[PDB]
Design a protein around this ligand. Structure first.
Ligand SMILES: Nc1ncnc2c1ncn2[C@@H]1O[C@H](CSCC[C@H](N)C(=O)O)[C@@H](O)[C@H]1O
Ligand SMILES: [Cl-]
Ligand SMILES: [Zn+2]
Ligand SMILES: [Zn+2]
Ligand SMILES: [Zn+2]
Length: 233
C-alpha cells in the first residue's frame, strides 16, 4: 500500500483509509515548526531574458545559500529567487509507503538528482525539560516509533503528535539522504536533502546516528552490507 502527500490534507478520507491500513495512523499535520514554549545577498538581479534562457537566480554563489541561510521576500531576484525552498515548500515528489518491517516510509516518485531538497522535518520544538518529559510519556505509552530530531542546543523537534510526511523517513546505515540545517528569518529549521541520485521507486533514508533520539535501541532492518545492527539507545 502507498499514498500521495495530498491524501493527508483530507482528514475524513485519511481516517477511513487508516481504519483499513491503507494509510498511516492519524497525526496533526502542520507546515511550520510549533514552539511548545513560545540581510540581502549580493546576487545580480537576472534580466527577463536571462530568466527565459534558464539562468538560475541565487544559485551556487549566493551569499545566503553559501551560509545555508534562505533569502527573504526582499531578495534582489524577487520572485525568481531559487533560495527560498523551505518557505515556498518546494518539496520533492515522494510517496508514503508501507515497508516490510519498519512501519511506513518514504520513496521517490520520480528520479531525484543529488542534493535535492526533499522535505522539511517539522514538529513541536521542545527544550530539554519538555523533551525529557516526552521521552518518559512515550515510554509509558509503550510507543514503538520515535520522532525526536536534534535541532540546536536546547532545541529538539518532536514529530510524534504534530508534523508532516517527513516524519516517515526511515533510518539507514548506508543512506541516500542527509539533514541540513537552514536559517529562515533568523530561525533554524531542519530539512532532508538527497546525497546521490535517487532512482524513482527507491526508499528515501537518512542516518539517524547522533541526530535522532530513541530511548530503546532498536534492531536495524536497513539491509546494507555495512549495517551497524541498531539505531537509537
Ligand atoms: N532501519 C530501521 N530499522 C528498523 N526500524 C526503523 C528503521 N528506521 C525507522 N524505523 C522505525 O521508525 C521509527 C522512526 S520514525 C520513521 C517513520 C516510522 N517508520 C513510522 O511508521 O511512523 C523508529 O523508531 C523505528 O521504530
Ligand atoms: Cl523493511
Ligand atoms: Zn542571492
Ligand atoms: Zn535570493
Ligand atoms: Zn542498518
Amino acid at each position: 500500500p502507498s499514498c500521495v502527500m495530498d491524501d493527508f490534507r483530507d482528514p475524513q478520507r485519511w481516517k477511513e483509509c487508516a481504519k483499513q491500513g491503507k494509510m498511516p495512523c492519524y497525526f496533526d499535520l502542520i507546515e511550520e515548526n510549533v514552539y511548545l514554549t513560545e540581510m540581502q545577498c549580493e546576487c545580480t538581479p537576472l534580466s527577463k531574458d536571462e530568466r527565459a534562457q534558464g539562468e538560475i537566480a541565487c544559485g551556487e554563489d549566493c551569499l545566503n545559500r553559501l551560509l545555508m541561510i534562505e533569502c527573504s521576500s526582499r531578495c534582489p531576484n524577487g520572485d525568481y529567487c531559487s533560495n527560498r525552498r523551505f518557505q515556498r515548500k518546494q518539496h520533492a515528489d515522494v510517496e508514503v509507503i508501507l515497508t516490510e518491517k519498519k512501519g511506513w516510509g518514504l520513496r521517490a516518485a520520480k528520479d531525484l538528482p543529488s542534493n535535492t531538497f526533499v522535505l522539511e522535518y517539522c514538529g513541536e520544538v521542545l527544550d530539554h525539560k519538555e523533551f525529557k518529559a516526552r521521552v518518559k510519556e512515550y515510554a509509558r505509552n509503550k510507543n514503538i516509533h520515535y520522532y525526536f530530531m536534534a535541532l540546536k542546543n536546547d532545541e529538539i523537534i518532536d514529530a510524534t503528535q504534530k508534523g508532516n510526511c517527513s516524519r516517515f523517513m526511515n533510518h539507514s546505515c548506508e543512506p541516500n539522504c542527509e539533514t541540513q540545517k537552514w536559517t529562515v528569518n533568523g530561525q533554524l529549521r531542519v530539512g532532508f536533502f538527497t546525497t546521490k541520485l535517487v532512482p524513482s521507486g527507491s526508499e528515501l533514508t537518512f542516518d539517524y546516528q547522533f541526530q535522532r533520539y530513541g530511548k530503546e535501541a532498536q534492531k536495524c532492518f536497513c539491509g546494507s552490507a555495512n549495517c551497524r545492527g541498531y539505531l537509537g539507545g
